[PDB]
Amino acid sequence: SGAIYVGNYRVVNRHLATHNDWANLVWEDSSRDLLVSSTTAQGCDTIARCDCQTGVYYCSSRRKHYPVSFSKPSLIFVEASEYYPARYQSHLMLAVGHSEPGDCGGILRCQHGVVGIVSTGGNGLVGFADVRDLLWLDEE
Numbered sequence: 001s002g003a004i005y006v007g008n009y010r011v012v013n014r015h016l017a018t019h020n021d022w023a024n025l026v027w028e029d030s031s032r033d034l035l036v037s038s039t040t041a042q043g044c045d046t047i048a049r050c051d052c053q054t055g056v057y058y059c060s061s062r063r064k065h066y067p068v069s070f071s072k073p074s075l076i077f078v079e080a081s082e083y084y085p086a087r088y089q090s091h092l093m094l095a096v097g098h099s100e101p102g103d104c105g106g107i108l109r110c111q112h113g114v115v116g117i118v119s120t121g122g123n124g125l126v127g128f129a130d131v132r133d134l135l136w137l138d139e140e
């Protein structure tokens with residue numbers, strides 16, 4: 001689990017979005033595993049605007065932050081999951097690291113701020129849904 005809170009936006013994994021998230025839907029992309037909902041409270045997170053390929057992510061299944069090198073956001077084939085069929089996920093960044101299903105929502109961060117959230121795992125890889133292209137998260 002986990003979310004990004006920026007302005008009046010809550011960014012979550014689309015497959016973990018709650019009734020409240022869907023009732024307050026701003027934007028969702030199935031191909032990216034992202035959903036953004038509106039919030040009444042002002043969020044404190046800053047989104048990275050950059051093309052960093054290194055950062056640190058939080059891994060709930062290890063209670064650890066790990067530094068990683070990750071690929072630029074791409075269209076990648078993602079095996080079967082208990083929350084998705086085998087399919088192509090877009091805007092996905094891969095690193096070598098540990099990721100189990102409950103690690104979804106762990107934040108990847110660089111010096112510029114939040115890069116994305118854990119979205120995929122298995123085979124010793126961790127996949128992160130990029131948010132840095134969603135420039136609209138940064139105003140109203």
Ligand SMILES: N#Cc1n[nH]c2ccccc12
Binds near residue numbers: 058109
């Ligand atoms: N987990 C974690 C964090 N590491 N660095 C941060 C900076 C701002 C907010 C949260 C964190």
Ligand SMILES: [Zn+2]
Binds near residue numbers: 048050052110
């Ligand atoms: Zn950066």
